[model samples]
Target: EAENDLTQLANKVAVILENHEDQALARSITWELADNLTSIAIIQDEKNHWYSPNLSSITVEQIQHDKDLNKALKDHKKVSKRTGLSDTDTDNERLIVGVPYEKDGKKGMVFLSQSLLA
Candidate 1:
């Protein structure tokens, strides 16, 4: 069941990235994709911040400053390096998968949390 969910999520992320040319539309698609998840965030790689529909009050900079989230991001990078997978790949620790996208020359990663997915 979990595997199926992840598969479905990967498909959704792919479709959104392929179809949505505008970042705003892509972000909206992300929110819809996150409807059944715990939390979802789109992190701007160059800016070092993220945008979460579920967490409207928190700015990307705020999330970046957050110790827990920051640690998770760093840990994810280490795991990616060790595994030789891109950082956009799935991470076992947090049960999250990131899909990469670029708009206006800014690279971004849409991270989906799978821990909360039923």
Candidate 2:
């Protein structure tokens, strides 16, 4: 049930990202996630930056600083293809659900963290 809820929340976030129309709605969602002890962030390759609505830039930067995180995300895609499961985190204390997306021909990754919840 918890996984399902997380999947649903991730879907909603993906929709918002694709549409590019609801900053307020997105903020609300992140707030709710935070209240539930979750954290959300968006990472883009082109800009090479991370954005967390409910977290400090320093926190987000620290997350991005870990090169292993990026490698884990890549490995996750391979593992997901082999197994019918989505990867959540790379054993980095912070369990993450990454939703890959493309906007304006640029690639982006949305990471939903349940570290606080754990």
Candidate 3:
């Protein structure tokens, strides 16, 4: 199931990169793709807990920083590296998006950045 999700995500990213000419739109699409794939983590505090104590605060931060999309992307990359996760670069410069995932009870992550591509 996890592999299937990743496969679908890769396909969606490829299609978006191939067809989307606007850089912002491409980045937004990629962000949405990542959010949807791992959004479950936001509400899950632990294996048995379904409601995260920080969910509300996290949502607020997400909204407050939404206006400055670049910072949000950079923060995502920073957290990824701090957590010792692997990240990928997009077609832009210094902008990055990431999806942190857990598989077989092991933590993993996917990173997409603009610096490596642009």
RMSD of each: 8.2, 7.0, 15.9
Segments of candidate 1 deviating more than 4 angstroms: 55-93, 102-106, 116-118
Decoy 2 TM-score against native? 0.55
lDDT of 3 by residue, 11-73 (tens): 455455445555346546555644321421121112321211211012322322444432433
Best-to-worst TM-score order: 2, 1, 3
Itemize residue pairs with steric clashes in candidate 1: none
- Best model number under TM-score: 2
lDDT of prediction 3: 0.33
Q: What is the TM-score of each candidate against the true structure?
A: 0.50, 0.55, 0.32
lDDT of 1 by residue, 1-118 (tens): 5445654674576567556776567666666656434356666564554455551122344335545545545444311111111233333333544455555665555555554322
Q: Candidate 1, TM-score vs. the true structure?
A: 0.50
Better of 1 and 3 by TM-score: 1
Candidate 2: C-alpha RMSD to true structure equals 7.0
Whole-model lDDT per candidate: 0.48, 0.49, 0.33
